Ligand binder design. Structure first.
Ligand SMILES: Nc1ncnc2c1ncn2[C@@H]1O[C@H](CSCC[C@H](N)C(=O)O)[C@@H](O)[C@H]1O
Lengths: 211, 288
């Protein structure tokens, strides 16, 4: 699947629909991508990551009190979203089908040529039935990005989305992984478990060319 | 319970000169109750597509509808291409299997197990069969489920389908005790139960000869609800079809046992309840 490219002179802000993220990954990582993000949406049931997100990011974020409250009016009121991301923190299928239900209402209709980009990531604890059924739901096939060629600790994720540069060209990055963090046990709990830095900048890499 | 708030979309009535027959997608058909009710109301059916797995239910449909039903296999085999190549649909119906949705199980697995998550398959086919913006075609949909669900499960279903679940109890129109939730956007979704005089309200009208009803109605003591020759006897399958509103001798289609007919009739819809629900479609679509 290939889409035609817009010229990069059209500098428009990015509308981000981030789902079940908790700690605001998309707003911060898009601030340090080098482009201006327009508005960010955050919502999570748990209170710890909401406290971290309301202390850290200085309140430039539209917050929703619960993920069980967003309707279609909440989608069309805060503008059509150009970027829709699901950031992973029996609620696994709960978080996925919340993401898919809100992705169905943020998808552009037949007639809109808007460049729509989305992203879903999930752990390797997935059942074979979950794998084939969810691959039927999204009508796509994910790619395995692993931390055996890039890192020491084990991190393996499979990615769905509309983000190119994901078939054969991508190998292992060298600079940002070795300048990211130092490996200690508390840091293994905080930034080694963190899924914000490693691949998400590469998945947001082909988005700054359009805007 | 007012947790969510959304107005139901009411479609304008189409006159008789632009009147067309119905195209019906029936996801979890089972016993073909929907097409039975549609044929009983005298509505022209241009296309009926049932995505059924169980071969006994497929046999019920092939006997009772004579090859009118277009069969699909599992609902997971249906894609968006199959929806867009089979024409635009006018009525989408279904009831997911409530093996893990029912709270009568002590060890229930919930909404997100392979018996419950098939509902989301429905939603996916609800997303594919729904017309895009700008199309004023009357599109109707109906989801059925049991009353014995959790608060969070029913809340998530009501949020996902974006409709108010009306509760309908079979005792107001038939001789069965089952309350079911109905999501949908049919006109008169919560209008009261117009009991038809042709419908068998009491239990004794559903019995055969020589049998006396012990109760007033049946449910879905170590005794039996029917006396027969001063002896407690098991409720018959054809009598169960008369209770559930089906025509007489409906689910006798193959060489299946008593337990298979119980498993089919238990999961089936109530014919009078559907007849009430499908009733206002008669003025929106073709008549025969
Ligand atoms: N994955 C699946 N896809 C389609 N049908 C399925 C299915 N899994 C089970 N079924 C069948 O579909 C039916 C759903 S059970 C409820 C049936 C519905 N209330 C009715 O009107 O009869 C069951 O009879 C079951 O045998």
């Amino acid at each position: 699947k290939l889409y035609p490219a817009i010229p990069a002179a059209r500098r428009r802000p990015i509308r981000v629909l981030s789902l079940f993220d908790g700690i605001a990954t998309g707003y911060l990582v898009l601030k340090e991508l080098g482009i201006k993000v327009g508005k960010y949406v955050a919502s999570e049931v748990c209170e710890e990551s909401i406290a971290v997100g309301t202390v850290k990011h200085e309140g430039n974020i539209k917050y929703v009190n619960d993920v069980r409250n967003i309707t279609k009016k909440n989608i069309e009121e805060w503008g059509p979203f150009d970027l829709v991301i699901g950031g992973s923190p029996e609620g696994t299928g709960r978080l996925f089908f919340e993401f898919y239900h809100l992705l169905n209402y943020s998808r552009p209709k037949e007639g809109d040529d808007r460049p729509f980009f989305w992203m879903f990531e999930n752990v390797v604890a997935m059942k074979v039935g979950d794998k084939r059924d969810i691959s039927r739901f999204l009508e796509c096939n994910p790619v395995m990005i692993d931390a055996i060629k890039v890192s020491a600790a084990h991190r393996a994720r499979y990615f769905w989305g509309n983000l190119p540069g994901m078939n054969r060209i991508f190998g292992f990055p060298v600079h940002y992984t070795d300048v990211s963090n130092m490996g200690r046990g508390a840091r293994q709990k905080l930034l080694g478990r963190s899924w914000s830095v490693p691949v998400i900048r590469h998945l947001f890499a082909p988005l700054k060319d359009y805007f | 319970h007012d947790q969510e708030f959304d107005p139901p979309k009411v479609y304008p009535p189409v006159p008789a000169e632009k009147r067309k027959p119905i195209r019906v997608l029936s996801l979890f058909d089972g016993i073909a109750t929907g097409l039975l009710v549609l044929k009983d109301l005298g509505i022209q059916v241009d296309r009926y597509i049932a995505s059924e797995v169980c071969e006994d239910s497929i046999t019920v449909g092939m006997v009772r509808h004579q090859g009118k039903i277009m069969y699909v296999g599992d609902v997971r085999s249906v894609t968006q291409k199959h929806i867009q190549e089979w024409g635009p649909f006018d009525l989408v119906i279904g009831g997911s299997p409530c093996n893990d949705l029912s709270i009568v199980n002590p060890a229930r697995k919930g909404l997100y197990e392979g018996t419950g998550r098939l509902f989301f398959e429905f939603y996916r086919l609800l997303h594919d069969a729904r017309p895009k913006e700008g199309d004023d075609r009357p599109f109707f949909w109906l989801f059925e489920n049991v009353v014995a669900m959790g608060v969070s499960d029913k809340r998530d279903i009501s949020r996902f389908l974006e409709s108010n679940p009306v509760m309908i109890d079979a005792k107001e129109v038939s001789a069965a005790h089952r309350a079911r939730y109905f999501w949908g956007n049919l006109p008169g979704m919560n209008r009261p139960l117009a009991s038809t005089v042709n419908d068998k309200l009491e239990l004794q009208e559903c019995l055969e000869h020589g049998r006396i009803a012990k109760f007033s109605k049946v449910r879905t003591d170590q005794h039996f609800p029917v006396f027969m020759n001063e002896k407690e006897d098991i409720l018959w399958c054809t009598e169960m079809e008369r209770v559930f509103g089906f025509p007489v001798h409906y689910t006798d289609v193959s060489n299946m046992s008593r337990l298979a007919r119980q498993r089919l009739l238990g999961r089936s819809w109530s014919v009078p309840v559907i007849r009430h629900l499908f009733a206002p479609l008669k003025e929106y679509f073709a008549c025969v």
